[PDB]
Write a protein that binds this ligand. Structure first.
Ligand SMILES: [Zn+2]
Lengths: 65, 56
RNA sequence: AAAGCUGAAACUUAAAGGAAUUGACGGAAGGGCACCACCAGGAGUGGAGCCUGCGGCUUAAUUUGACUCAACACGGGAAACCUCACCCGGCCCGGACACGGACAGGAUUGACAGAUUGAUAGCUCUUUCUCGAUUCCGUGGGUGGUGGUGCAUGGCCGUUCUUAGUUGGUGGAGCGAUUUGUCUGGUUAAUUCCGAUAACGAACGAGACUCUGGCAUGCUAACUAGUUACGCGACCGGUCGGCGUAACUUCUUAGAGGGACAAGUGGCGUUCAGCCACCCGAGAUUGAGCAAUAACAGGUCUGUGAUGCCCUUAGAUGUCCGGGGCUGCACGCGCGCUACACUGACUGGCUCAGCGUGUCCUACGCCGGCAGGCGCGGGUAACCCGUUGAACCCCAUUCGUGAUGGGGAUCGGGGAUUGCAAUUAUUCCCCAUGAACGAGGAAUUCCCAGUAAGUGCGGGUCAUAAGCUUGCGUUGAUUAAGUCCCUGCCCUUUGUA
C-alpha cells in the first residue's frame, strides 16, 4: 500500500462528565452551566452543547450562533 | 453393497414389478465410480414410464 | 577368391517368446445403411459493407469458461449504473458462541459547524455534545464468498450413436479367458418377422405408447362464437362487420365416439415373412416427444442453502458506494443481416393470416411533418386492443443499363422518449453526406413437398430493446425414388508384432 495505515477514531475518555453541567453553591443554587435544548422531546432532559463559537445538540442536531 | 441390497430385497418383497437402485460418487478411493443394482422388470421409453415407474 | 567348418568372453537386461480368446484397426473380402455422405439439382456461404462471438496487439483493467464433428449469435452472455467477476479509490461488520480484562465514578453509539473528501462519507482531524451492557479489546471458534481444483465430487446436460444394438437363469462346448442362445438363407425402417436350430425359457432397447396434422352436413352443447330467416332503418329486387328477436350448429370452440388394417383386387415371392401396382377413400410413408447396455479423465464448483479438501477472513478474495473497463484496434478466423438491380427500385390505389402475450396491452378524441406530446375509456381477458384491415404478392404511375431515382456504409447539424444518469454517441425521428459492392479464387454448408427459398408477425431477453434464437402463418419451386465413388455407420468372414 502507498498510505502508511488508516487508524479508526478512538473516543477521548473523559471522567465523570455530568459534574461540569451543574455548579451547586454551599446554600444550594443549582445553576445549569450549559444551555437547555429548546426542542420538544429534549426539553428538561438534554443539555445542549457550548462550542467555542456555537451551540449544538447531539440528539436533534439543532445549532445556534 | 449391504445397504442397497437391503433396499432391493425390501422393495421386491413389498411386491414391485422390478427395482433399480444406483449409487454414484467416491464409493472407494479418490476416483468417482458408480454401482447399479437391478431386479425384476424396468421400462425406460414411451408414455408408460411417466405412470408405471416412480423415481427418487 | 568369395567364404565354409569348429567357436568364446567382458558387459547388459525382466522379460524375449509359443498357442488361443475378446476388442480395436486394415490403402482385405461379403451383405446392407445416411442429404450432419455423395449423385441430380435448389438456395447458398467463402469475395463486399456492416452486426455480433472468438483469437492476437494494446491497456490500469480490457473478468472469464469453452478450441474438429463433441469451442467461436454458446454460458439462455442484447454488460451505460446494478449486473460484475476485472482495474483505481473510499465507508461498513452483517467477527455467532465461549473464556479473561474493561465497566453506571459510563463498556459503547450517533453527530451540528469548520477543515478534509469525488461525496451533505462524524471516514478522519479540531471542538464538544448524545445513546445506555445491546457493545469494545485479547485469544480459541465461526461466518461469508462469481476465490482455486470439473483430473476430488453429486446432480442435470452433451457426445460416443440415430444406427439396432444389450444382458441374466438353467442346459450344451472348452483346463481357461470365453463362446452358444444373440443364426446358414429369405424378409423389415428395425436382433422386424418367417424358418432353420445344442439349445430352451426370458428381460431392456425397436415396436406398442403419449401429444400434434388430416376426415364426420352423425352425437352433446353455446348472448364471452357465428349462420339462416324475419322485423326496422340507410342508400340505390341488390349492399350493409347498420340494430333487435325465432329454427339451429354448416362455418367457430372441444368433449365423447367412429375411421386405416397392406383390409379388397391383380401380379411377384422356397405361394411364409413379406414386396410392387391398382380400385374405394380425407388419408395407403404427417411432424414430434420419450428413448437401452457400456463409456468419455467431454462441459459446468460463474444456477443453487448440491458439495469434500485448499485459499483468504476486518488496511477481506466478505459486503457496499462513487468512477472506469467488459465495446479498448497495423491484423486472422466462425455464425449471420443488407446488397450488387429493370422478374427491379420509387409513388399511389386494392386485398388476405396464424401461433400467442398483455396490472402493462391498448381503442377513441385533440395538437404536432415525424418521433411523440395531452385528455378520457375498455380488458386480470373467445368479453377490450381485434373482424388481430401484416409484408411479399396484385393493379396503375415515374425511372431507363448510367456506381443510375440500384446499395445506404461512413460522417455534420438539429428534434423527441426511457432512466437518478445517455459522452466512448441506449433506442427513435427529420434534413444533409452518398464508400465498397457489376454475382465472388481455392474451398465448403444445408436440404426431398406444404419441403427449399422469399416474406412478414408473436414469444424470450425487455426501464430503454433484435442484425439473435424460439415459434407461427403467408407465397411456394427445380431435381431424385438411386448408389457405396468420397465421408462415416451396422452385421459377418478373415489378417495383426
Ligand atoms: Zn435537542
Amino acid at each position: 500500500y502507498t498510505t502508511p495505515k488508516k487508524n479508526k477514531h478512538k473516543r477521548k475518555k473523559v471522567k465523570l462528565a455530568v459534574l461540569k453541567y451543574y455548579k451547586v453553591d454551599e446554600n444550594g443554587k443549582i445553576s445549569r452551566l450549559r444551555r437547555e435544548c429548546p426542542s420538544d422531546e429534549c426539553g428538561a432532559g438534554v443539555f445542549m452543547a457550548s462550542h467555542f463559537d456555537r451551540h449544538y445538540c447531539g440528539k436533534c442536531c439543532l445549532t445556534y450562533c | 453393497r449391504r445397504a442397497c441390497y437391503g433396499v432391493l430385497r425390501f422393495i421386491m418383497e413389498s411386491g414391485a414389478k422390478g427395482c433399480e437402485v444406483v449409487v454414484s460418487g467416491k464409493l472407494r478411493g479418490q476416483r468417482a465410480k458408480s454401482m447399479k443394482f437391478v431386479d425384476g422388470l424396468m421400462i425406460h421409453s414411451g408414455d408408460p414410464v411417466n405412470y408405471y415407474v416412480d423415481t427418487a
